[PDB]
RNA sequence: ACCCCCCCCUCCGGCCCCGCCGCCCGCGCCCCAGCCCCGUGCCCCCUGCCCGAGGCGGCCCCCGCCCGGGAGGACCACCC
RNA sequence: CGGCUCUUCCUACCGUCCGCGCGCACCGGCGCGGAAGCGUCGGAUUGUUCACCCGUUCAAGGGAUCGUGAGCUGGGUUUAGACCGUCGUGAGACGGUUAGUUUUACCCUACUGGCCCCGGGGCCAGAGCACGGCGGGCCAGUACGGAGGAACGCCCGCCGCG
RNA sequence: CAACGAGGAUCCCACUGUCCCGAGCCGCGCCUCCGCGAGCCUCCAGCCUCGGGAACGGGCGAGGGCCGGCCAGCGGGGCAAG
RNA sequence: CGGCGUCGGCCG
């Protein structure tokens, strides 16, 4: 029922969230350096990490996650947020 | 046992101890913090209480009830002759915090800041930089003396003095403070600018700004030797006590077996140093400008000093600055004022429409002694 | 500036000097001062009291328009 | 939904000059003669310290012997309307009644008369947009 | 509406772990201690009433 | 993380710089690694026992009241 | 003995803070861990501690010679006057009741301030310490689910304290 | 049981600094000075925390503080005095 | 009364 909005940003080194479930508060997540993000060209509402260390990728991907927590709700219920669906190595 | 219903303890024990200061004055034991880049300006000026008067001013804020409403607020008057800069010193950053390089002083300095150098003047021999005027007297000296300066220091702070002979005080020595030069590019182009104020006089219209907010630093009103009521705020005991109901009734617990420094006792209230933050700056104007206090809303012209003069001050001269509210100490006191440290984020703007010149020695009713004339026409 | 006229005697009053009083027959009364509210509250007749507007008038020194 | 609690607004801190144990007089035209006040919403206190009351504040009464058999024995709100203690406003005006009154009326805003005798406050009538209807004047 | 995949995939994160009944918390699947207290008394995460 | 520590803020022995203007004392500098430890597992070992510049680091010394007003005050002190 | 006044401490945590769990849709409740900074109040009857009701921003439990009488007060208990009921042959005894002097610091320490004359401007070792709580507007009658009914954030006030 | 009571109780009107919550002022003491000039009390002394101990230490064991000399005040301790 | 902390044993 709320469409989140995602602008990557300072040429695919940020990324801002904007109105995760209608909230007036704005996200701001900086990569730690060598990791780039991009949307998705493929598939809608998907979000691409890349980079050579696999520490620095995750690291970024759980940063992420953190900072879209519902409040003081039945998490079973409200189920709104980013996951990470795919692990791997990239295909060229 | 507990102590059976709940109740804060009283008095602040930060302020601690309730002694008289033995400073002299406020001094300014804090600076803004410099940031490497900005403009170049001056931090901090020294004035005298002049008094209080209160101002009519229309009230731009948003989601106030005042939001497009006129408002009566209190100002306070602060006098501010031009300070004279005579004097630099720079500062290091050590393991052992600030450390001075050397402190270079002007060839020529006047008398309100010799006379600060010796108890009685009339009767004193006067040797006084006696040495100093004659090597400095050629300005190489003087190069050579800020050629470490700009090799050594972090940190650069002029050294200026008030001049009393402009005020209606009866001191005639000056009042010397340090005021530290922030912004600029490098050390080395905050010397260049500490430089061209030598021997030369310095405004507060070239520190302060309108709608910006200050700090005021002075000594507060004393009382000598007072109470536990007075002094502390304690509740006083019901009527039938035998010896007396202005004390505190227990001063400790059997243990431990001593009397604790948190407790509320009898001595000196008042005359304390003391720093008010956060004060928003009305108008900066000089009292030769006959036209300095007229808005439009009145046709006469008016101007700063009251009609009657200022109640237990004197007459006002040259400069003078106006912020809103309070400030410490009685009328005469020397107030320092430095830029805010943390200041207040929604203050609105200023915008004034009306001042009371009217008398202050009594209930006066007529801001003009013209129109007072007028009133009593024969 | 915007002024009012003292109730009691016939002074003006400048921007916050004074206070007001609202009488029970709504009624609104404006004071220089308390030395013209005690005047008031007291029923002394503001012509017998020299120095007011009333007084005066009604002494020939003050012209009526 | 159809909360509406009572109070419009925000309101600035004026002097209160109406302490517990306090007796008004009633405005309206209920029945009711003088009020006994009782108790004051929205104070914590302090100990020691006795609640207190100013214009435009609600308060809980009694209904005293002079009044109407029906109303009395029972805890009622109230709104004070007038007050003698003088108060200043922001506009740097200060200003006073000649007598301390007050009206029945319920959280939700609704009067128990039909009429308000006199003047009665600003304070008062903003906060509460049923009295500013019914007043006759307003100072 | 969350599209069916989305739920399975947000499921893994808000459902499908252990609790531990001493002390409440979040555990593995198939762990047999806790993390935290080190008891072997550990129940699964209740369904929700739409889950 | 309302907690804890620091800033701001109050007191503050001591110290530093600057004005007016001498004494004494000491003699010795790579740095960084320990599951590379780079070829180690030593030197010093006489502060008088016969040692005693310049530079580089230390040390000492150096500054009136009474009197009268006050914004200060028991007396003192404090600010003029 | 209690009460009044005043300070400091404990945590076995009642509200507020941060995390998890539910027979957690929302709202509101309940259970657990960390947490002692601030808050825990105004009155009617009783000497009361305790208790019991009324009201409010809805109201945890304790310690310090059962903290605290050269700090007070003296209602209770607790001498000598007096009355009643039961008991005693009697002088008298014991559940209720009324009237009944609250003394001294100038010593030592502790504590609060003040002093033992020495230029102008500064720096900082040690010690002190202070911004919590409750609302309103917008978000929004929206998310959630019919009745009902939230939140991050920003902005505007109030109360207590300083 | 009318009248009467420096007798013990409950309530109301009026009154008020009893209280919310305290503030300002007057005289005399205190305080400083010239003159005069005592009592009480005293093993020896006079800073704390813990331990042990005649089970609550100023001294004893262990730690933490501290030139020395005085005034106006004050009531925690000296298990203060009587 | 609990412990997939670490080192050592006995019975299958
Ligand atoms: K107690
Ligand atoms: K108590
Ligand atoms: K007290
Ligand atoms: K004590
Ligand atoms: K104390
Ligand atoms: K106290
Ligand atoms: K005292
Ligand atoms: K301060
Ligand atoms: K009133
Ligand atoms: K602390
Ligand atoms: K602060
Ligand atoms: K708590
Ligand atoms: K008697
Ligand atoms: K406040
Ligand atoms: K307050
Ligand atoms: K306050
Ligand atoms: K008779
Ligand atoms: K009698
Ligand atoms: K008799
Ligand atoms: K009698
Ligand atoms: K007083
Ligand atoms: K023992
Ligand atoms: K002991
Ligand atoms: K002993
Ligand atoms: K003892
Ligand atoms: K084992
Ligand atoms: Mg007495
Ligand atoms: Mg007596
Ligand atoms: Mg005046
Ligand atoms: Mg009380
Ligand atoms: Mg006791
Ligand atoms: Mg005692
Ligand atoms: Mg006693
Ligand atoms: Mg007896
Ligand atoms: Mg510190
Ligand atoms: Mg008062
Ligand atoms: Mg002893
Ligand atoms: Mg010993
Ligand atoms: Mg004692």
Same mark, same amino acid.
């Given at each position: 029922?709320?469409?989140?909005?995602?602008?990557?940003?300072?040429?695919?080194?940020?990324?801002?969230?904007?109105?995760?479930?209608?909230?007036?508060?704005?996200?701001?997540?900086?990569?730690?350096?060598?990791?780039?993000?991009?949307?998705?060209?493929?598939?809608?509402?998907?979000?691409?990490?890349?980079?050579?260390?696999?520490?620095?990728?995750?690291?970024?991907?759980?940063?992420?996650?953190?900072?879209?927590?519902?409040?003081?709700?039945?998490?079973?219920?409200?189920?709104?947020?980013?996951?990470?669906?795919?692990?791997?190595?990239?295909?060229? | 046992?507990?102590?059976?219903?709940?109740?804060?303890?009283?008095?602040?024990?930060?302020?601690?101890?309730?002694?008289?200061?033995?400073?002299?004055?406020?001094?300014?034991?804090?600076?803004?913090?410099?940031?490497?880049?900005?403009?170049?300006?001056?931090?901090?000026?020294?004035?005298?209480?002049?008094?209080?008067?209160?101002?009519?001013?229309?009230?731009?804020?948003?989601?106030?009830?005042?939001?497009?409403?006129?408002?009566?607020?209190?100002?306070?008057?602060?006098?501010?002759?031009?300070?004279?800069?005579?004097?630099?010193?720079?500062?290091?950053?050590?393991?052992?915090?600030?450390?001075?390089?050397?402190?270079?002083?002007?060839?020529?300095?006047?008398?309100?800041?010799?006379?600060?150098?010796?108890?009685?003047?009339?009767?004193?021999?006067?040797?006084?930089?006696?040495?100093?005027?004659?090597?400095?007297?050629?300005?190489?000296?003087?190069?050579?003396?800020?050629?470490?300066?700009?090799?050594?220091?972090?940190?650069?702070?002029?050294?200026?003095?008030?001049?009393?002979?402009?005020?209606?005080?009866?001191?005639?020595?000056?009042?010397?403070?340090?005021?530290?030069?922030?912004?600029?590019?490098?050390?080395?182009?905050?010397?260049?600018?500490?430089?061209?104020?030598?021997?030369?006089?310095?405004?507060?219209?070239?520190?302060?700004?309108?709608?910006?907010?200050?700090?005021?630093?002075?000594?507060?009103?004393?009382?000598?030797?007072?109470?536990?009521?007075?002094?502390?705020?304690?509740?006083?005991?019901?009527?039938?006590?035998?010896?007396?109901?202005?004390?505190?009734?227990?001063?400790?617990?059997?243990?431990?077996?001593?009397?604790?420094?948190?407790?509320?006792?009898?001595?000196?209230?008042?005359?304390?140093?003391?720093?008010?933050?956060?004060?928003?700056?009305?108008?900066?104007?000089?009292?030769?400008?006959?036209?300095?206090?007229?808005?439009?809303?009145?046709?006469?012209?008016?101007?700063?000093?009251?009609?009657?003069?200022?109640?237990?001050?004197?007459?006002?001269?040259?400069?003078?600055?106006?912020?809103?509210?309070?400030?410490?100490?009685?009328?005469?006191?020397?107030?320092?004022?430095?830029?805010?440290?943390?200041?207040?984020?929604?203050?609105?703007?200023?915008?004034?429409?009306?001042?009371?010149?009217?008398?202050?020695?009594?209930?006066?009713?007529?801001?003009?002694?013209?129109?007072?004339?007028?009133?009593?026409?024969? | 500036?915007?002024?009012?006229?003292?109730?009691?005697?016939?002074?003006?009053? !400048?921007?916050?000097?004074?206070? /007001?009083?609202? $009488?029970?027959?709504?009624?609104?009364?404006?004071?220089?001062?308390?030395?013209?509210?005690?005047?008031? !509250?007291?029923?002394?007749?503001? /012509?017998?009291? $020299?120095?007011?507007?009333?007084?005066?008038?009604?002494?020939?020194?003050?012209?009526?328009? | 939904?159809?909360?509406?609690?009572?109070?419009?607004?925000?309101?600035?801190?004026?002097?209160?000059?109406?302490?517990?144990?306090?007796?008004?007089?009633?405005?309206?035209?209920?029945?009711?003669?003088?009020?006994?006040?009782?108790?004051?919403?929205?104070?914590?206190?302090?100990?020691?310290?006795?609640?207190?009351?100013?214009?435009?504040?609600?308060?809980?009464?009694?209904?005293?012997?002079?009044?109407?058999?029906?109303?009395?024995?029972?805890?009622?709100?109230?709104?004070?309307?007038?007050?003698?203690?003088?108060?200043?406003?922001?506009?740097?005006?200060?200003?006073?009644?000649?007598?301390?009154?007050?009206?029945?009326?319920?959280?939700?805003?609704?009067?128990?008369?039909?009429?308000?005798?006199?003047?009665?406050?600003?304070?008062?009538?903003?906060?509460?947009?049923?009295?500013?209807?019914?007043?006759?004047?307003?100072? | 509406?969350?599209?069916?995949?989305?739920?399975?995939?947000?499921?893994?994160?808000?459902?499908?772990?252990?609790?531990?009944?001493?002390?409440?918390?979040?555990?593995?699947?198939?762990?047999?201690?806790?993390?935290?207290?080190?008891?072997?008394?550990?129940?699964?995460?209740?369904?929700?009433?739409?889950?």
């Amino acid at each position: 029922h709320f469409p989140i909005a995602a602008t990557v940003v300072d040429n695919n080194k940020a990324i801002e969230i904007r109105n995760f479930m209608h909230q007036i508060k704005t996200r701001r997540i900086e990569c730690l350096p060598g990791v780039t993000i991009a949307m998705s060209t493929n598939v809608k509402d998907e979000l691409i990490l890349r980079g050579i260390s696999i520490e620095d990728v995750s690291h970024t991907a759980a940063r992420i996650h953190e900072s879209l927590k519902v409040p003081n709700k039945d998490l079973r219920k409200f189920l709104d947020g980013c996951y990470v669906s795919s692990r791997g190595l990239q295909e060229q | 046992s507990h102590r059976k219903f709940s109740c804060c303890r009283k008095g602040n024990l930060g302020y601690l101890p309730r002694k008289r200061c033995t400073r002299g004055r406020g001094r300014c034991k804090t600076f803004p913090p410099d940031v490497q880049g900005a403009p170049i300006h001056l931090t901090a000026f020294l004035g005298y209480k002049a008094g209080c008067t209160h101002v009519m001013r229309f009230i731009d804020h948003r989601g106030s009830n005042l939001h497009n409403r006129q408002a009566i607020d209190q100002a306070t008057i602060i006098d501010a002759p031009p300070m004279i800069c005579t004097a630099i010193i720079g500062y290091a950053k050590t393991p052992k915090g600030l450390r001075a390089v050397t402190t270079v002083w002007a060839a020529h300095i006047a008398e309100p800041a010799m006379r600060r150098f010796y108890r009685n003047y009339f009767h004193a021999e006067k040797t006084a930089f006696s040495t100093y005027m004659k090597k400095a007297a050629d300005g190489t000296y003087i190069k050579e003396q800020l050629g470490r300066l700009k090799q050594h220091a972090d940190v650069i702070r002029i050294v200026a003095h008030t001049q009393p002979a402009l005020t209606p005080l009866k001191q005639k020595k000056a009042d010397i403070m340090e005021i530290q030069v922030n912004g600029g590019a490098n050390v080395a182009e905050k010397v260049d600018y500490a430089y061209a104020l030598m021997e030369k006089p310095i405004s507060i219209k070239d520190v302060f700004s309108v709608g910006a907010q200050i700090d005021t630093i002075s000594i507060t009103r004393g009382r000598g030797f007072e109470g536990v009521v007075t002094r502390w705020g304690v509740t006083r005991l019901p009527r039938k006590t035998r010896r007396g109901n202005r004390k505190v009734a227990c001063i400790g617990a059997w243990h431990p077996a001593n009397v604790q420094y948190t407790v509320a006792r009898a001595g000196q209230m008042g005359y304390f140093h003391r720093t008010d933050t956060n004060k928003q700056v009305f108008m900066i104007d000089t009292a030769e400008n006959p036209r300095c206090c007229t808005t439009e809303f009145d046709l006469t012209d008016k101007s700063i000093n009251p009609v009657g003069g200022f109640v237990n001050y004197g007459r006002v001269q040259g400069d003078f600055i106006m912020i809103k509210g309070t400030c410490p100490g009685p009328k005469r006191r020397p107030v320092v004022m430095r830029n805010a440290l943390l200041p207040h984020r929604n203050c609105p703007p200023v915008q004034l429409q009306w001042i009371s010149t009217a008398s202050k020695f009594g209930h006066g009713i007529f801001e003009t002694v013209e129109e007072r004339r007028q009133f009593y026409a024969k | 500036v915007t002024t009012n006229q003292c109730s009691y005697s016939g002074r003006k009053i !400048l921007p916050g000097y004074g206070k /007001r009083m609202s $009488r029970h027959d709504k009624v609104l009364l404006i004071f220089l001062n308390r030395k013209a509210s005690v005047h008031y !509250l007291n029923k002394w007749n503001p /012509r017998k009291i $020299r120095w007011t507007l009333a007084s005066r008038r009604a002494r020939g020194k003050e012209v009526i328009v | 939904k159809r909360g509406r609690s009572g109070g419009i607004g925000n309101k600035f801190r004026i002097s209160c000059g109406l302490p517990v144990g306090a007796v008004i007089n009633c405005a309206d035209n209920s029945g009711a003669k003088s009020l006994n006040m009782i108790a004051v919403k929205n104070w914590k206190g302090h100990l020691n310290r006795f609640p207190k009351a100013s214009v435009g504040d609600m308060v809980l009464i009694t209904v005293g012997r002079d009044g109407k058999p029906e109303l009395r024995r029972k805890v009622t709100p109230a709104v004070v309307v007038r007050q003698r203690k003088v108060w200043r406003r922001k506009d740097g005006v200060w200003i006073y009644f000649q007598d301390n009154a007050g009206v029945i009326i319920n959280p939700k805003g609704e009067l128990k008369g039909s009429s308000i005798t006199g003047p009665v406050a600003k304070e008062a009538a903003d906060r509460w947009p049923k009295i500013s209807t019914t007043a006759e004047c307003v100072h | 509406v969350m599209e069916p995949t989305l739920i399975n995939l947000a499921r893994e994160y808000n459902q499908n772990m252990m609790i531990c009944r001493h002390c409440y918390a979040r555990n593995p699947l198939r762990a047999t201690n806790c993390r935290r207290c080190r008891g072997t008394n550990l129940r699964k995460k209740k369904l929700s009433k739409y889950a």
